[PDB]
Design a protein around this nucleic acid. Sequence first.
DNA 1: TCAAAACGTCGTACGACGTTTTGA
DNA 2: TCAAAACGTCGTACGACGTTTTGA
Lengths: 152, 151
Amino acid sequence: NTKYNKEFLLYLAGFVDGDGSIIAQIKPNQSYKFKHQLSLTFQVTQKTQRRWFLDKLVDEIGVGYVRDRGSVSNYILSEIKPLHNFLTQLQPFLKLKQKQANLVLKIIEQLPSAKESPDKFLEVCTWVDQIAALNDSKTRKTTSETVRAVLD
Amino acid sequence: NTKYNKEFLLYLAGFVDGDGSIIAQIKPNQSYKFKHQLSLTFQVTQKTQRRWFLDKLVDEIGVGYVRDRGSVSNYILSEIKPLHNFLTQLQPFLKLKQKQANLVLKIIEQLPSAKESPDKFLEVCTWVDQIAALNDSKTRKTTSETVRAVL
DNA sequence: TCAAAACGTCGTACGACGTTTTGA
DNA sequence: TCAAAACGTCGTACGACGTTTTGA
């Protein structure tokens, strides 16, 4: 892993609480077993002028990347093992997004177990619902209950 | 004149850097000698469902109040002295808003110096701009020129 | 099959201002 | 003539999804 110092973890938990985003998706893909991918994405969208912030932010955390969208850039971390580490250390300090982080961790820890059984998959898809609910969910298309459809 | 928890200062500096607002307005009013009020505001906006978090702020910081906006809510701190204290302690831990902090600080300090000698009042009004420059301003109306041309 | 990356999308919510009153 | 509250309101990000690709 990598072990994050407490001064830094404190600041970050603050900044994540206000300006930052924890996303959980079920992505229709024909390529998979259950024909859905479970993606966890942690992300912070800054204004490209400020990319230095997201870049320093890449260097400090030591994992993940910055994508330039044009006027805006994101810091993205989709890598599961580092993500899990990041979110365990941050969770204790989160005053707002704490539950979503705990839900991301629960989802991750159970990921392998979910590939095995169909109805076990849906139990995990519900948590990626519960996560969605804790954001203001707009364009959401694929839910846990969309999956149950095909699974039959 | 409260001293703050460095643990809580770090979290807050992180929070403010992301979600916080430092606003410097030149607000024309007909009362004042120079016919402008000088106004500093540090605000945090949160959906009213989360209003407790705003209350926590009123508590941890000790001063300021929550305004219920309907579906959303603001924590406001407009009191100059508490604001100068708060920003002094927070300023070293600010990354993204760091500059704004030190302007509101340097403004607050020069306030009485501005109450007297308008050419200095102008010099200070200038600092409001530079703050508005660090935010991306949208509806900005009254500026340091707006005042000056009337001086 | 899977973890990841790559990339496309858009309706409004709210930051950052306004204006005007209170209570000295 | 002040500080400080009260209250009002708009433009363009942007957040939270989305689809598709990559390479083992």
